[PDB]
Amino acid sequence: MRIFGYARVSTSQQSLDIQIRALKDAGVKANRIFTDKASTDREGLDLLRMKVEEGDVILVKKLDRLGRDTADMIQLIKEFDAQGVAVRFIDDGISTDGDMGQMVVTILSAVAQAERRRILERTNEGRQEAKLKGIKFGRRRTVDRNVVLTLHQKGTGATEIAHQLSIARSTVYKILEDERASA
Amino acid sequence: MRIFGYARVSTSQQSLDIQIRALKDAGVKANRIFTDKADREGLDLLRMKVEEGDVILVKKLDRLGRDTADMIQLIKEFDAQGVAVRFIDDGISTDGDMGQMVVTILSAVAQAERRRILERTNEGRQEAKLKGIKFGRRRTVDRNVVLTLHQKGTGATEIAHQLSIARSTVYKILEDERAS
DNA sequence: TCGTGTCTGATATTCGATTTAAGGTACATT
DNA sequence: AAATGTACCTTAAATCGAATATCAGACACG
């Protein structure tokens, strides 16, 4: 019944020390904590993979701090559950053990195979070149592209369209470049 | 307590008929089944018809949304209406006992992948908090005026009407400067 | 001197979960 | 009836870094 913990960041040392301090207050010994930072340097996680034994429990601050994605996360959770090793996520109040633990691993296994079949879908038609994150980032497009394309198609010069729609001349070329690359 | 079901494919009509046949073997009426193909119109019609207490039968999880994020978004949207979803093959239900547990965990899964994208952002925010950078809204209210008037014995309602602020705002300001 | 392409850097948003400020309601009290 | 405190809940800005759009010129060439 050994207690372990894991913490992962990209760069920041402070937010890493935040997790470590949380694990230490959770009753995890200092030597029982493994960490990583960004090549794929997982050595802290790999060392945890080695040391863990049946009956051992691994404490993690949040779900996002485990895998590099949803797939990797469940892949890891399954890996520890196979060995009887339980994972408890502190802030989210979730565990792979106790009572609901099996239900936890069950639904986690469902979405895993579900998205794996979704990967099998995308792979056939093709997606990955696109790489959809799902969150909308950046300034919204306020410019009507259709008007720009139509005018230029009629032979209207670059500076004439820019003066027409009150955009920059460079903006016109960016629009023409984006739609040309699209075609 | 009406029974509904959903089936989704990309191209193949055969795999669609498989789901439909499976839904009908589960005791769903023929007019209670909605389908879509690569056009969410069938799913949108389902969103409209459903009411609190109704349950939806789906063959598998992957047959719901276009990705994991969309799926959880849908399930949350139905759970918000009290509508439940039971996946046949995966053996998972959003009602009864496990119901809260399903929504709770799927919420954590979704919020985790978003926080994964925000990793470098919210870490830089933690270093910013460390530097002492002030978060939250900036104070537009002069604290001196509020505290000076109150020192002379001006009532709370009067200061509020004076500076055109809220009454509870004055108390909160007095509380902050007293506690420190 | 002027218009056209190609290019880089500077502004401008917009995101999500969190964090403080302010507005607002509700209840009990004086 | 009116003003006074006290207790939480909604809006309302404001945060980081990354991502997307637009602006503003520079530079070379005919």
DSSP A11-39: S-SHHHHHHHHHHHHTT--GGGEEEE---
Reported resolution in A?
3.4
Give Cα separations from A4 to A58, A77, A91, A93, A181 (angstroms): 5, 14, 16, 17, 51
- Left (φ > 0), alpha (ψ -120 to 50) or beta: where does B120 sit? alpha
Chain A contact for B123 (CB, 8 A cutoff)? yes
Residue among B26, B47, B50, B24 nearest B36 (CA): B47
Q: Find the helix packing angle between A158-165 and A169-182, rounded to 10°.
A: 110
B131 touches strand D (CB under 7 A): no
Q: Which residues of A touch B75 (CB under 8 A)?
A: none
- Give the integer Cα–Cα distance in Å for B105 and A57: 19
d(CA A98, CA A86) in angstroms, rounded, equals: 9
Beta strand pairing call for A57-60 and A94-95: unpaired
Question: How distant is the alpha carbon of residue A106 from its chain centre?
Answer: 21
Separation between Cα atoms, residue B173 and residue B154, nearest integer Å: 14
Asked whether the beta carbons of residue A62 and residue B98 sit closer than 8 angstroms, the reply is no
Pair of tokens at residue B162: 């004076």
Interface contact flag, A12 B92, Cβ < 8 Å = no
Q: For residue B33, which of B3, B61, B6 has the smallest C-alpha distance?
A: B6
Instruction: Give the DSSP letter of residue B98.
Output: T
Shortest-distance nucleotide from A142 CA to C1'? D21
Secondary structure of residue B93 in the 3-state scheme: strand
Q: What residues contact B75, with CB distance under 8 A and at least 6 apart?
A: B64, B85, B94, B102, B103, B106
CA distance A86 to A88: 7
Q: What one-character-per-residue DSSP string does B102-127 give?
A: HHHHHHHHHHHHHHHHTHHHHHHHHH
Please give the span between the terminal C-alpha atoms of chain A, in angstroms, as a whole number: 61
| Spatial CA neighbour of A85 closest among A50, A109, A113, A61 | A50
The DSSP bridge partners found for residue B145 are none
Q: Partners of B21 in the beta sheet? A: none
- Phi, psi (5° rounding) for residue B154? -65, 135
What are the phi and psi torsion angles at A69 (to 5°)? -160, -175
Type of residue numbered A39: S
Domain that holds residue B89: 3-108
Beta bridge pairs of residue A60: A6, A89
Of the residues A8, A10, A12, A89, the best mutation for testing chain B's interface (the one with the most B CB atoms within 10 Å of its CB) is A12
Q: Phi/psi of residue B166, each to 5°?
A: -80, 155
Contact: A135, B124; criterion CB under 8 Å: no
Return the closest-CA partner of residue A132 out of B40, B113, B74.
Answer: B113
Report the chain A residue with the minimal C-alpha distance to residue B63: A114
Compute the nearest-CA separation of A117 from chain B (Å): 7
* DSSP-assigned letter for residue B94: S
Distances (CA, A) of B68 to A116, A119, B103: 10, 11, 13
Angstrom distance (rounded) from CA B91 to CA B74: 18
* Phi, psi for residue B165 in degrees, rounded to 5: -105, 180
Distance CA(B165)–CA(A112), nearest Å, equals: 53
The helix (H) or strand (E) run that includes residue A89 is strand A86-89
Strand segments (E) across chain B? 3-8, 33-36, 55-58, 84-87, 92-93
Distance CA A160, CA A167 (A): 10
CATH of the domain at A84: 3.40.50.1390
* Separation between Cα atoms, residue A173 and residue B7, nearest integer Å: 44
Contact present, B159 and B149 (Cβ < 8 Å): yes
Give the helix/strand (H/E) hosting A111: helix A101-125
